[PDB]
Specification:
Regulator of sigma-E protease RseP (chains A, B), four-stranded antiparallel β-sheet, globular, homodimer, two-stranded antiparallel ribbon
């Protein structure tokens, strides 16, 4: 139900470094289409330090960006984080 | 599908101030039961600067905490943020 559309981008995060912005919609990761935030988050979690090739939509137009999921300060889990919050209905 | 269980808590956020920790499960907000992260996030979004009464579960035991959703630096939308990321399957 949560839409793959960014509400907020955190500073010095994978998302800011990738050039993501509030309002951006995640459309494809590594060529694979997605429609749910959880799909995107699962991929991010599973891929710390791996380049994900993103196709996003901004203002109805496509952009190709690279996102590399990172750890978070204070978190020692072997997972990647986005650095952004999603929009909710 | 995303579980109302925290994977990470951000510093100087509503969640850290509330005393929330990774692994905590959100069980009730203002007496109302929830089972999905989106339900919790909707409430947070809708309630900037309003005290939400949280019942959480940590290690299988209930705790009562207060959470006051806040804005994020650089975001001028009239909404509240949690200050945390959820666990995903």
């Amino acid at each position: 139900m949560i839409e793959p559309v960014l509400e907020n981008v955190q500073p010095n995060s994978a998302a800011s470094k990738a050039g993501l912005q509030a309002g951006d919609r995640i459309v494809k990761v590594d060529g694979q289409p997605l429609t749910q935030w959880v799909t995107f988050v699962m991929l991010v979690r599973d891929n710390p330090g791996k380049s994900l090739a993103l196709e996003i939509e901004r203002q109805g137009s496509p952009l190709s960006l690279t996102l590399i999921p990172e750890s978070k300060p204070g978190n020692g889990k072997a997972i990647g984080f986005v650095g952004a919050e999603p929009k909710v209905i």
